[PDB]
Amino acid sequence: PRRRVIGQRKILPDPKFGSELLAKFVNILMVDGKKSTAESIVYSALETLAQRSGKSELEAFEVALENVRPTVEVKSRRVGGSTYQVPVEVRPVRRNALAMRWIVEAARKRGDKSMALRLANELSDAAENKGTAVKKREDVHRMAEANKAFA
Amino acid sequence: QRIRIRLKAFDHRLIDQATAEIVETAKRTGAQVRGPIPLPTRKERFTVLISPHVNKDARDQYEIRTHLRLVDIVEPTEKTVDALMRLDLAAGVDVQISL
């Protein structure tokens, strides 16, 4: 990425609802290149989440995603031997990509019976903004407002 | 009945040139000629260490391509059998006669 100015790979939409954002989400959860068992956990978690929150499977994801979605983050930069954290405004595409990544990582660190249950209860905690995933956006916020002078 | 000729050679531009001689000699002396049938090539691959001592990653990779050709002559005419028997073919080509 020094000289070469690359774009971004346009991935195929979701086989169920035709959402590109969900296709990003299944891939983030996906491990060992097992897409079949990956969408099986994402659909089972969406089926158990929308049922236990009042339908709208696309909108119930969006409510949980709006609370984890960050606005600003720090960028590590060494100027004069010292490492300064520069607060930078994140782009809309990476905004969702970080939001989805923290949802999967927080559900993985949970102690529930299954990943379909771990994900659904993490998406439920994020919809009401009271979990490990919303706290990762909170710690990223406290880091940005502190170094607000070096903007 | 039917005479089956199986050709083997490491060089390709030698096998189909010696095959063309067999096909032409048989179809000129009046015989029913099936083929030249190109059968799959057996690629015997070899990986040898290029350094006399140590240097595990440094290697030489070679192959021996064993090309196969099948020529089936239906009519065993005396004019065809004798024409094919007294044919000077390339010394680097193996001929397998199947009755």
């Binding site: - | 690629k43 015997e44 070899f46 040898v48 260490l49 030489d60 990779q61 021996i64 680097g92």
Partner: protein, 100 residues
């Protein structure tokens, strides 16, 4: 390898075709037949009295020019070093540097 180490292999070949090819094979198949003689054979005992070097498993595959016991290939009968040397001179037929 050494001249003595090369000579030791000539002895292991000459004794391999003398006994364990036409005589010891006959008493080994006999020491396997369940139908005939289950206790009084002596074939296992008379196999010992035969020279050790006569066994084919006791023979080591060595580079047919140098005598190298390591890096051997049965296709050429030479070690990886002398395989490369003859391969580059075109002395090995149909053999060339492959890429795929």
């Amino acid at each position: 390898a050494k001249q003595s180490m090369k000579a030791r292999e000539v002895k292991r070949v000459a004794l391999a075709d003398k006994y364990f090819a036409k005589r010891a094979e006959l008493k080994a198949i006999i020491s396997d037949v369940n139908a005939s003689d289950e206790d009084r054979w002596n074939a296992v005992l008379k196999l010992q009295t035969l020279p050790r070097d006569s066994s084919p498993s006791r023979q080591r595959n060595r580079c047919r020019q140098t005598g190298r016991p390591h890096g051997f290939l049965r296709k050429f009968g030479l070690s990886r070093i002398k395989v490369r040397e003859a391969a580059m001179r075109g002395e090995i037929p149909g053999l060339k540097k492959a890429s795929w």
